[PDB]
Amino acid sequence: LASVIPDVATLNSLFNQIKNQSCGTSTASSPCITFRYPVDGCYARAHKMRQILMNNGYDCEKQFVYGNLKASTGTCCVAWSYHVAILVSYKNASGVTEKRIIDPSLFSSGPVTDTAWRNACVNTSCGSASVSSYANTAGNVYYRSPSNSYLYDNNLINTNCVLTKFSLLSGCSPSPAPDVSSCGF
Structure with missing residues (x-):
């Protein structure tokens, strides 16, 4: 695998997939x-x-940020006290291991700096917004907790389930998400 990208070219790809x-x-x-x-x-x-990412041959990381995370879709706004994305590492134009966000949940056009990412999360476009804190974790780490606890869903029982739940779901509603207890990694 590759926990780092040789050039954005590959980065844009990882996302393309x-x-x-x-x-x-x-x-x-x-x-x-x-x-x-x-x-x-x-x-x-x-x-x-x-x-x-693995398909392409690259291992990414996770990043959980806390605080007022607003946003605007033009049809409805969203607010989260904590967001999560994937911390990707790609060589800059100087050959330096940088960080990027491949979360289309904010930027569908392309990736953005872990920073600009958080911003898109704290998009005041809706109103008040700010990042209380942030942290990164292993890519495998399915979900992260504020107690310094990491999870791992190799069967995506909590993931595929989460999705399957919002399979027909569309828009910013219903919000927040319904009950997904049916799941269980």
Whole structure:
């Protein structure tokens, strides 16, 4: 694998694939990632995106940020007290290991600096927003807790389930996400 990218060229690719998973595509897995239903599902997909990364041959990381995370879709706004994305490492134009975000939950056009990412999360476009704190973790780490606890869903029982739940779900509603207790890694 590769925990670092040689050039953005590859980075854009990693995303190009993860994007191919976008719900609605004919090349998207199942359950695909519900991107058309931005509400809570942030980590779920993440775990997925990772699987897509492995395909290309690159290991990404996770990043959980806390605080007021607002956003605007033009049709509805969203607010999360904590977001989660995938911390990707790609060589800059100088050959330096930088960080990037491959979360289309904010930037579907392309990746963005872990910083700009958080911003998109704290998008005041809706109103108040700010990042209380942030941290990174292993890519495999399905979900992270504020207690310094990491999870791992190799069967994506909590992920694929989370999606399957919001399979028909679309838009910022229902928000927040419903009950997914039926799941269980």
